[PDB]
């Protein structure tokens, strides 16, 4: 999530993002994965405790 902004072009004259330069979604058939260190989200299960 939020990888798409790194794909965008940049206008130094305005400090604004342009259209996409990089493909944000092409994987080249690789399944290469990044560990999200903040994955821990609390849940509760009232059917248990």
């Amino acid at each position: 999530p939020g990888s798409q902004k790194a794909a965008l072009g940049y206008n130094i004259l305005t400090q604004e993002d342009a259209q996409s330069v990089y493909d944000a979604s092409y994987y080249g058939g690789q399944c290469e994965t990044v560990y999200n260190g903040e994955w821990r989200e609390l849940r509760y299960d009232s059917t248990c405790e």
């Binding site: 609390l42 849940r43 509760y44 299960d45 009232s46 059917t47 248990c48 405790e49």
Partner: protein, 168 residues
Amino acid sequence: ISTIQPKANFDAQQFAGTWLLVAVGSACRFLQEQGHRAEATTLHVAPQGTAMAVSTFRKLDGICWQVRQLYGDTGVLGRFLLQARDARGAVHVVVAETDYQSFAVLYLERAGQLSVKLYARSLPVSDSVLSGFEQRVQEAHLTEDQIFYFPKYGFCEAADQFHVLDEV
């Protein structure tokens, strides 16, 4: 599996207020697996129309936590649903039995996975009530080996602003 009969003419306003969890009967693994640190829990309960708000309070590693949930009514008195908030699936609820000032036995079930929980207004529970709970368990086809108790002490109230799950 069936929706058993609730408390006759369930009075949400009388059932309102503070309940302490005492014991749980369930086939749920995580009461028997890792059955240690069955940390004490309590509810604040309020009517919100026919639905009810509930604040479960708990400790977690000594950090006090509050989970707020709406028990949506089924359109039927004493019968409620909890929403599939995290795709957990909805949980059916029945106020099977209560003395509003003393004790409650609540039925909860999801996907045929069934639990019954005994709450009290009080540290003690009448052994006749506890015995009734045992038979409730047997009638639910649960074993005595699936009954688990919670400690007498260490209930928490008023979890911090940062320790409220607020699932709703």
